[PDB]
Amino acid sequence: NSLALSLTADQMVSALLDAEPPILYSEYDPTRPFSEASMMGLLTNLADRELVHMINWAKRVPGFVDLTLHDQVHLLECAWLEILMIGLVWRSMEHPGKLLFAPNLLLDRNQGKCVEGMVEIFDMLLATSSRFRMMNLQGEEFVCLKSIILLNSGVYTFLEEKDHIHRVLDKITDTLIHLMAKAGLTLQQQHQRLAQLLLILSHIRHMSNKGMEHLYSMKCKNVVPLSDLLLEMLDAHR
């Protein structure tokens, strides 16, 4: 059974907001200019650290610890870079033109040209960030979207617990629209806005697919050493 299926819309939000990981810092040294290998080392060092916090966040996502350990593994393998990117995009919402990788690592579109192949991905991230800002994405909605990515991204690549996952995904949809009803939206605007938010997840998935390929190119060319967790995280996608 579970208890996640009987939370109220307000307690779902409350649980998710309380499960949020901390905002981490870069060990960037603002006195030493960038190379392709330094920035990249900086990015994957942060990613590796964010990854361990994400795993403890997922465990706090209502319905998640009900899954088999095998199912939890597969969902995080599928979703990790998406979760990283939706986080980055949200952080960067009120810094137009910039990606806030960490409070002390705020990178301009142009600095992405430091890494080869990186700038086209920067651009997609920035455009997503612009979309968020245009819609005025709220913190309560953000945490819903992020949970939805965790549960949704690997669900179809699996005892029908697909059904349990689908049941809780339904709870997060209700939560999203409750937040929209609460903000004074009409029924028509709630359903339009829900569709808007969900179609962006398609673009987040696109960016993760591309990022995985880039990350893999840097792995092969040994420009940067990646942690063990990152390696294994990257190996799951091939």
Binding site: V52, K59, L69, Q72, V73, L76, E77, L229, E232, M233
Partner: peptide
């Protein structure tokens, strides 16, 4: 024996 596996157990 995945690291992820261990981290989730932990």
């Amino acid at each position: 024996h995945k690291i992820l596996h261990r981290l989730l157990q932990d």
